[PDB]
Amino acid sequence: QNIQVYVRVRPLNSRERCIRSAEVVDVVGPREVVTRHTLDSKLTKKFTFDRSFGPESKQCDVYSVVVSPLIEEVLNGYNCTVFAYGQTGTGKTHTMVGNETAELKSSWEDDSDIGIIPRALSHLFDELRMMEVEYTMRISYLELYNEELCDLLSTDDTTKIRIFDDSTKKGSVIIQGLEEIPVHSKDDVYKLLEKGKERRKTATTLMNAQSSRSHTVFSIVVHIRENEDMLKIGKLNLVDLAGSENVEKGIRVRETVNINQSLLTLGRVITALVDRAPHVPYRESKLTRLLQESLGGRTKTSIIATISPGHKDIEETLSTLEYAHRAKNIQNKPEVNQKLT
Ligand SMILES: Nc1ncnc2c1ncn2[C@@H]1O[C@H](COP(=O)(O)OP(=O)(O)NP(=O)(O)O)[C@@H](O)[C@H]1O
Ligand SMILES: [Mg+2]
Q: Count other Cβ atoms within 10 Å, centred on residue 185.
A: 11
State how far the Cα of 291 lies from the Cα of 140, in Å rounded to an integer.
Answer: 15
Is the distance from CB of 330 to CB of 270 less than 8 angstroms?
A: yes
Cα torsion 49, 55, 59, 63 to 10°: value is 0
168 is in an annotated binding site: no
Q: Resolution in angstroms, to 1 decimal, for this deposition? A: 1.7
State how far the Cα of 183 lies from the Cα of 138, in Å rounded to an integer.
Answer: 6
Domain spans, the chain: 4-339
Way the structure was solved: X-ray
Q: Is the CB of 54 under 6 A from ligand 1?
A: no
Nearest C-alpha to atom 1 of ligand 1 is from which residue? 10
Q: Which of 145, 247, 110 is nearest to 98 (CA)?
A: 110
In order of 164, 244, 305, 330, the CA distances from 33 in angstroms are: 39, 20, 11, 20
Buried-exposed string 256-284: b where 16+ CB fall within 10 A, e elsewhere: bebbbebbebbbbbbbbbbeeeeebebeb
Q: Count CA within 13 A, CB hemisphere, residue 184.
A: 0
State how far the Cα of 269 lies from the Cα of 179, in Å rounded to an integer.
Answer: 28
State how beta strands 79-86 and 231-240 pair.
parallel
Is the distance from CB of 241 to CB of 305 less than 8 angstroms?
A: no
Q: Is the CB of 243 under 6 A from ligand 1?
A: yes
State how far the Cα of 150 lies from the Cα of 200, in Å rounded to an integer.
Answer: 9
Q: Is the CB of 93 under 6 A from ligand 1?
A: yes
Ligand 2 mean position to 72 CA, how many Å?
Answer: 27
267 is in an annotated binding site: no
- β-strand partners of 136: 223
State how far the Cα of 47 lies from the Cα of 66, in Å rounded to an integer.
Answer: 18
92 is in an annotated binding site: yes
Is the distance from CB of 235 to CB of 336 less than 8 angstroms?
A: no
Q: Count CA within 13 A, CB hemisphere, residue 261.
A: 13
87 is in an annotated binding site: yes
For residue 244, the ligand closest to its alpha carbon is 1
3-state secondary structure the chain: CECEEEEEECCCCHHHHHCCCCECEEEECCCEEEEECCCCCCEEEEEECCEEECCCCCHHHHHHHHHHHHHHHHHCCCEEEEEEEEECCCCHHHHHCCCCCCCCCCCCCCCCCCCHHHHHHHHHHHHHCCCCEEEEEEEEEEEEECCEEEECCCCCCCCCCEEEECCCCCCCEEEECCCCEEECCHHHHHHHHHHHHHHCCEEEECCEEEEECCEEEEEEEEEEEECCCCEEEEEEEEEECCCECCCCCCHHHHHHHHHHHHHHHHHHHHHHHHHCCCCCCHHHCHHHHHHHHHCCCCCEEEEEEEECCEHHHHHHHHHHHHHHHHHCCCECCCCCCECCC
Is the distance from CB of 136 to CB of 223 less than 8 angstroms?
A: yes
Nearest C-alpha to atom 17 of ligand 1 is from which residue? 91
Which of 3.40.850.10, 3.40.50.10160, 3.40.50.1370, 3.30.1330.10 would CATH assign to domain 4-339?
A: 3.40.850.10
